[PDB]
Design a protein around this ligand. Structure first.
Ligand SMILES: [Zn+2]
Ligand SMILES: [Zn+2]
Ligand SMILES: [Zn+2]
Ligand SMILES: [Zn+2]
Lengths: 375, 375
């Protein structure tokens, strides 16, 4: 295996438009695979680090972690993947042999769990991307905004080769995070009520999960009212904008539902929203689930009696899905027509116009925009 | 049915010794039962309201809610109890026909749930106790520090008539609160580790529950080191006094257990302890359970990532036991030799020396002191 010269969308500077560059992609080392990306999409997380909003900024960098592609080659020690396999790169991995992977409960692999600071590969700490002999840094070990990328095999989910990669690429992050938050963690029973804070891809995945679970009432909470109408296609039965009410939103929800919803799922990462999501569930049997990741360090706060009145608060990561074990199953759920993905896709652009996907997201116009390589 | 003249231990004034008085006990009204108390014990909750520490103080008052006795008569509409039945009064009830009672998850009856302010009966708002025509107020609808008391039937658990009332009287509050907090809510699997904050009756019930569940490691946390040795009889494998460590106790526990315990149970009601109990459980699969009731209004606070790292926080009330449905079953657990109650009993006094039970508790010398009527 040798070096590949291809196109990648490089971020040279925070908040500036990506530039299509010719980059060089080194061959995969031990336990790595090199993937030809066919379709990729944009997630709020790409945007957050591209703006360098909070974290330690790292540039130049190739973003992107939602994608579908085909294995071009594998490094030594790789046995579960071969050239030609259809795959989804995942931003967090499953080594399959650590304490967390062995557990039935957790998907937080000690080897391969999400790391937003890391710009190089595990094996040697180096980037496989370069331009004129200078490193272009990785993002989440996936960097899918490139015609070719290199990814640790534990972060590569082999899927059904008949599944259309331009649809199921969105399964690798946002949608599955919400879907699993509901189906694996909240676990609403048939007939129950659910409140969902946030109506982006995670929230709409959570709603979709509640619909699949047979929830009879699904209340969407978002500050942008223009997200409301489309939300009904995902099973949301009514939407509430906290701005239209003087009362705290948890009180509004509790009055709507004679004491509160049976389940809630907080998908925005706002701490105030976490607090509201917890307090809006019913006493006795209410269960709140946090999945949105916060940008601030503000503490979760609440009066202890809210708990002693028999509420439960659960946090989850990536919907408690195991990347390699479970995600292929999620693709099947779509193949077998339980899961409806098409409605998540509101836009499509060629790789050459990738910056448009940023525009659509920053304007709140899109759910997911599919970016198509080779055009 | 007519009026009974008997002895009761009356509190006339906050923090002052109880006085044995001759009181009059009116006959039971609709859905009420009148009980001859044979054995009763003291709980920290009696003491807290007797000192009038926080709540709205109400005097004169007859305290006591842990007891075993025999039904003397029943009011109209009572069908599940008859004179001669062996019973345990419970501080919180089960009407059996409200939304909370119908639920599989909750024991927070809409009709009969704990009320610490109420000095009279539900039916008419009046007390059945009097001295010289003046009311002596009820406590938790049980008031068991009297040779005879009147209690709503929903708060009266008929139990096995062969069970010794001078042992199983402690089953009606503290012990069962802890036992159930562990067995019904924490639900530790065989081999797991458990941290228990507080080594009073609730904590020792929680420990006993963890032992019964087959926990391999049970770590007791209490500020009073003299509670440690006796705790081993309850299954505690080691004890830790936060005062002997510079590090925060949740860090100490996490270092003892390679990341934290599998389960924790907070039994003191200290808010700081609730925070520590939550943070000391392991990421991925850790579950913390709050059951101790706070005396202050301080908020529970913690960094949200502690949740998103896949921790779970559960609050419970009375160990999630249904008073009438489950508590008789707990007595059987003792009859069938699964549950060991004798070790909870460290003292015994006659009703005439009831104030001694207060002394033993205030000196931290006792777990439970049995008070015996008729002497
Ligand atoms: Zn692993
Ligand atoms: Zn994402
Ligand atoms: Zn009820
Ligand atoms: Zn008590």
């Amino acid at each position: 295996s040798q070096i590949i010269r291809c196109k990648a969308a490089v971020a040279w500077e925070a908040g500036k438009p990506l530039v299509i560059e010719e980059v060089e992609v080194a061959p995969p080392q031990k336990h790595e695979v090199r993937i030809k990306i066919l379709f990729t999409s944009l997630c709020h997380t790409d945007v957050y680090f591209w703006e360098a909003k909070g974290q330690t900024p790292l540039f130049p960098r190739i973003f992107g972690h939602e994608a579908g592609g085909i294995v071009e080659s594998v490094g030594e020690g790789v046995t579960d993947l071969q050239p030609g396999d259809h795959v989804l790169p995942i931003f967090t991995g499953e080594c399959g042999e650590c304490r967390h992977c062995h557990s039935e409960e957790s998907n937080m692999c000690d080897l391969l769990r999400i790391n937003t600071e890391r710009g190089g590969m595990i094996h040697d700490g180096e980037s496989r991307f370069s331009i004129n002999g200078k490193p272009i840094y990785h993002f989440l070990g996936t960097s899918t905004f490139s015609e070719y990328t290199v990814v640790h095999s534990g972060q590569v989910a082999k899927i059904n080769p008949d599944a259309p990669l331009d649809k199921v690429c969105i399964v690798s992050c946002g949608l599955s995070t919400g879907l699993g938050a509901t189906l694996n963690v909240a676990k609403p029973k048939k007939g129950q009520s659910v409140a969902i804070f946030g109506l982006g891809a995670v929230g709409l995945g959570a709603a979709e999960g509640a619909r699949i679970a047979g929830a009879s009432r699904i209340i969407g909470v978002d500050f942008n009212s223009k997200r409301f109408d489309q939300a009904k296609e995902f099973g949301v039965t009514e939407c509430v904008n906290p701005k239209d009410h003087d009362k705290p939103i948890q009180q509004v929800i509790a009055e709507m539902t004679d004491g509160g919803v049976d389940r809630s799922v907080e998908c925005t990462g706002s701490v105030q929203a976490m607090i509201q999501a917890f307090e809006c569930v019913h006493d006795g049997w209410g269960v709140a689930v946090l999945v949105g990741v916060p940008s601030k360090d503000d503490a979760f706060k609440t009066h202890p009696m809210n708990f002693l009145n028999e509420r439960t608060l659960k946090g989850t990561f990536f919907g408690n899905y195991k990347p390699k074990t479970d995600i292929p199953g999620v693709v099947e759920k779509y193949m077998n027509k339980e899961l409806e993905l098409e409605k998540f896709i509101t836009h499509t652009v060629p790789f050459s116009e990738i910056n448009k996907a940023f525009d659509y997201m920053l304007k709140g116009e899109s759910i997911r925009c599919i970016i198509t390589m080779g055009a």
